[PDB]
From a paper:
The selected template antibody was AAL160, an anti-IL1β antibody that was isolated from immunized mice. AAL160 binds IL-1β with high specificity and affinity, yet its VH sequence is 99% identical to germline IGHV5-51*0,1 with only one Gly54 to Ser difference, and its KV sequence is 100% identical to germline IGKV3-11*0131. While AAL160 is a mature antibody, as it was generated via immunization and hybridoma technology, and has 0.4 nM affinity for its ligand, its specificity seems to be determined largely by the sequences of H3 and L3, due to the germline nature of the remaining CDRs. We also note that, among the latter, 10 side-chains correspond to the germline sequence. Remarkably, only two of these conserved paratope residues are in H3, and of the rest, all but one of the conserved paratope residues are germline residues. The ability of identical residues in the two different antibodies to mediate interactions with the different antigens may be attributed to AAL160’s germline likeness.
Using a small, focused library, we engineered AAL160, an anti-IL-1β antibody, to bind the unrelated antigen IL-17A, with the introduction of seven mutations. The final redesigned antibody, 11.003, retains favorable biophysical properties, binds IL-17A with sub-nanomolar affinity, inhibits IL-17A binding to its cognate receptor and is functional in a cell-based assay. The structures of the 11.003/IL-17A and the AAL160/IL-1β complexes highlight the contribution of germline residues to the paratopes of both the template and re-designed antibody. This case study suggests that the inherent plasticity of antibodies allows for re-engineering of mature antibodies to new targets, while maintaining desirable developability profiles.
Author numbering:
A (entry chain L): 1 to 212
B (entry chain H): 1 to 132, 138 to 218
C (entry chain I): 3 to 153
The structure:
């Protein structure tokens, strides 16, 4: 039935700052609009009901306003627990559409990652596989390019990355990139290198090792 | 305290039937509508359907009509969501929530994770990420396990500062893999013993791996 | 307490349906689509009673949901309210649930007992909410007919 459009997709701000989130309905309906907060790893919870009423136990810094099709959620001064995903919802007869959500992320000063490379263990090699792990630790912003080089040749398709959620104490991210090779392919080459490009580094940084 | 408590995480194979539950407490369950909401990994919330427990009056979203069955046993304050034939695309967190005359879901269940995959259960293989500035990094690679989750602690939970346990990544094989790392003073490598404790409840596997330089 | 199962239609023969879980809407239904209409359990409750004014409560049949009148945004408003099934229906219903069923010619009006001269109303337009209106005889419709349903 109706569509709810939220903006921005990601709102980056610091604790102490004012946040304004938007939700726009494709059509105007008579049902009451609600806002939900979903903290990382937790279930959603009701924040605001009928566009401007705080749900039970919701702090005063949260307020809501709007009418017709345009709705707004405001946090007067952000607290670290407020960095979460926010969704709007408004019933359309018997259908219940949700907005696509807005992620509220902590903006902090730029921090270059500490880069470490780990060769495969001899125990893993014995089983016929070699996993080479590259660690990018405590960096900000989240955007980072990690390129694998084996004997100075660029690799593609043979690696996978994983990124942590923003740290609760220092607001940085950490990232792992794992290159997987067979034991035979691993022993055919000598130099294994992980090259990192990030805003905090003046030039890309490489961590490498010579097999054995 | 008003609350909704859901049944535990499920791991199934495509084609299998499944029924998950949502138990109400601290209020008259019979008197409020209960909704079901799906959240696929990394995606937003999608309403599936709603039921009035008093007379089991049920309404479904057109995207879920005929694909799932919502039911309720008001005698034990429980609402259910069931599939006769699971798909791999049904892999999602499912929430139940109480709907009120304020047109809002005021109380939510904790969620039930449903993982649908043709893979069978398997404990991880744990390998060291050996330590090679004043700071050194070390860790454990927890590879080829199924299903989620694994927990990783360091030195039986006594080492927590500087620990990062990455979210698992599903490999092409249908098995998961992750690393858990910790940064420590490089001067402590000769003094301190570092052991990662890996627990995989689905396979009752518990591995303590000593990571040496 | 004595109760009767029934349906209501406004004077333009619009039927009442559940719009969502806590609101009703009025629309022209005929044939098989009439099965969508809401069935009420009308209870005969305690209250000031006159010859053409009878106090009633309007619950949804087999549901612990009742129509009630409350101030919302400083305005008398009609809502559907959840109640504890152990305690309802009862003869001594709280005033927010009481309506004075009034006979007007061959029709019925339902005045809020809490808010004098506020009535259960429908709009002339299709698919609009049932609401509480402070006018009777304007564009908004305040008169209905009642159809009896089997026990």
């Amino acid at each position: 039935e109706i569509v709810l459009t939220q903006s921005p997709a990601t709102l980056s701000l610091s604790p102490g700052e004012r946040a304004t989130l938007s939700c726009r309905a494709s059509q105007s309906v008579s049902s009451y609009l609600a806002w939900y907060q979903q903290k990382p790893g937790q279930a959603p919870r009701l924040l605001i009901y009928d566009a401007s009423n705080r749900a039970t136990g919701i702090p005063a810094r949260f307020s809501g306003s709007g009418s017709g099709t345009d709705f707004t959620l405001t946090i007067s001064s952000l607290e670290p627990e407020d960095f979460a995903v926010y969704y709007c919802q408004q019933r359309s007869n018997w259908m219940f559409p949700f907005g696509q959500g807005t992620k509220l992320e902590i903006k902090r000063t730029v921090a270059a990652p500490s880069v470490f490379i780990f060769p495969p263990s001899d125990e893993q090699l014995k089983s016929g596989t070699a996993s080479v792990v590259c660690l990018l630790n405590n960096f900000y912003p989240r955007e980072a390019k990690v390129q694998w080089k084996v004997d100075n040749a660029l690799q593609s398709g043979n690696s996978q990355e994983s990124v942590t959620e923003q740290d609760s104490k220092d607001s940085t991210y950490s990232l792992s990139s794992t290159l997987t090779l067979s034991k035979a392919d691993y022993e055919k080459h000598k130099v294994y290198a992980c090259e990192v490009t990030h805003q905090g580094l003046s030039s890309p940084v490489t961590k490498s090792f010579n097999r054995g | 305290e008003v609350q909704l408590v859901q049944s535990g995480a499920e791991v199934k194979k495509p084609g299998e039937s499944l029924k998950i539950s949502c138990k109400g407490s601290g209020y008259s369950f019979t008197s409020y509508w209960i909704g079901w909401v799906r959240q696929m990994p990394g995606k937003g919330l999608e309403w599936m359907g709603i039921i009035y427990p008093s007379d089991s009056d049920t309404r479904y979203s057109p995207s879920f009509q005929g694909q799932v069955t919502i039911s309720a046993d008001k005698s034990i304050s429980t609402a259910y969501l069931q599939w006769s034939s699971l798909k791999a695309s049904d892999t999602a967190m499912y929430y139940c929530a109480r709907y009120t005359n304020w047109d809002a879901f005021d109380i939510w269940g904790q969620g039930t994770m449903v993982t649908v995959s043709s893979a069978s259960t398997k404990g991880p293989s744990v390998f060291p990420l050996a330590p090679s500035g004043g700071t050194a990094a070390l860790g454990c690679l927890v590879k080829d396990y199924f299903p989620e989750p694994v927990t990783v602690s360091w030195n039986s939970g006594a080492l927590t500062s500087g620990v990062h346990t990455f979210p698992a990544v599903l490999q092409s094989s249908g098995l998961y893999s992750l690393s858990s790392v910790v940064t420590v003073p490089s001067s402590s490598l000769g003094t301190q013993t570092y052991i990662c404790n890996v627990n995989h409840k689905p396979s009752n596997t518990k591995v303590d791996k000593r990571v040496e330089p | 307490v004595r109760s009767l199962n029934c349906t209501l239609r406004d004077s333009q023969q619009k039927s009442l349906v559940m719009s969502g879980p806590y609101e009703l809407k009025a629309l022209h239904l005929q044939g098989q689509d009439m099965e969508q209409q809401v069935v009420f359990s009308m209870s005969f409750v305690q209250g000031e009673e006159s010859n053409d004014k009878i106090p009633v409560a309007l619950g949804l049949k087999e549901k612990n949901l009742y129509l009630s009148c409350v101030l919302k945004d400083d305005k008398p408003t009609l809502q559907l309210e959840s109640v504890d099934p152990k305690n309802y229906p009862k003869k001594k219903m709280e005033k927010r649930f009481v309506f004075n069923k009034i006979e007007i010619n061959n029709k019925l009006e339902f005045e809020s007992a809490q808010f004098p001269n506020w009535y259960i109303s429908t709009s002339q337009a299709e698919n609009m909410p049932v609401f509480l209106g402070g006018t009777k005889g304007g564009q908004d419709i305040t008169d209905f007919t009642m159809q009896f349903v089997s026990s």
